[PDB]
Ligand binder design. Structure first.
Ligand SMILES: C=C[C@@H]1C[C@]1(NC(=O)[C@@H]1C[C@@H]2CN1C(=O)[C@H](C(C)(C)C)NC(=O)O[C@@H]1C[C@H]1CCCCCc1nc3ccc(OC)cc3nc1O2)C(=O)NS(=O)(=O)C1CC1
Ligand SMILES: [Zn+2]
Length: 190
């Protein structure tokens, strides 16, 4: 089946909050036809397959998500199923053409290390960048807490995308740092 947009994380105001936009059955029909009529809004999409839900982030005109969530799937669209433009397993990276109506996050140009991770729950966690592709969490959470939030953006203090969340570095089933796909890697791909 196709990957279907089931919602969006809202950043366009003070609060971050997920608006779910489609039902399970609606998701199933639209996964199956690959034709999606629903309007697209914002930067961070909530996407799901038949069995998993995760996030998808628009950066430089391309909707980015994790390969471990989307596999090789097409995305359901107004004109039908769309094959991936970008698919890189080593990087765990896949991209489609950003859907009509979506907005891109501007890439971070500030070199700021006080980062922020937007989860599926629309919580905004401070992350402290610790490397070329790693940020430690100020407050550590259980791995369950972050699960389902891959493909989501890591933001600088100016609201710009720094990377895409990919994997959680876990000790005793507690995430203490997050592994991301820095924008610079997306541009290498593009
Ligand atoms: C808990 C939040 C976390 C963000 C989430 N990511 C994962 O769970 C990833 C997927 C998988 C394991 N992940 C992990 O995070 C593990 C885990 C033990 C699960 C905590 N952590 C981990 O390895 O830490 C090690 C230091 C890093 C080493 C680097 C890891 C490599 C990353 C990775 N790459 C590829 C490339 C290609 C593949 O093809 C099939 C598959 C891959 N799988 C991968 O890891 C998430 O929420 N997902 S999700 O939304 O529920 C799902 C629907 C989409
Ligand atoms: Zn910045």
């Amino acid at each position: 089946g196709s990957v279907v947009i089931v919602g969006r994380i809202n950043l366009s105001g003070d609060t971050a909050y997920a608006q779910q936009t489609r039902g399970e059955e609606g998701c199933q029909e639209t996964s199956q036809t690959g034709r999606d009529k629903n309007q697209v809004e914002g930067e961070v999409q909530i996407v799901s397959t038949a069995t998993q839900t995760f996030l998808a982030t628009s950066i430089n005109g391309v909707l980015w998500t994790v390969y471990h969530g989307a596999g090789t799937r097409t995305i359901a669209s107004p004109k039908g199923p769309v094959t991936q433009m970008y698919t890189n397993v080593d990087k765990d990276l896949v991209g489609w053409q950003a859907p009509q109506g979506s907005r891109s996050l501007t890439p971070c140009t500030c070199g700021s290390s006080d980062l922020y991770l937007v989860t599926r729950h629309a919580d905004v966690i401070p992350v402290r960048r610790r490397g070329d592709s790693r940020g430690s969490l100020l407050s550590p959470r259980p791995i369950s807490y972050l699960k389902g939030s891959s493909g989501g953006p890591l933001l600088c203090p100016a609201g710009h995308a720094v990377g895409i969340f990919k994997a959680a570095v876990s000790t005793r089933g507690v995430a203490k740092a997050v592994d991301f796909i820095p924008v610079e890697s997306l541009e290498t791909t593009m």
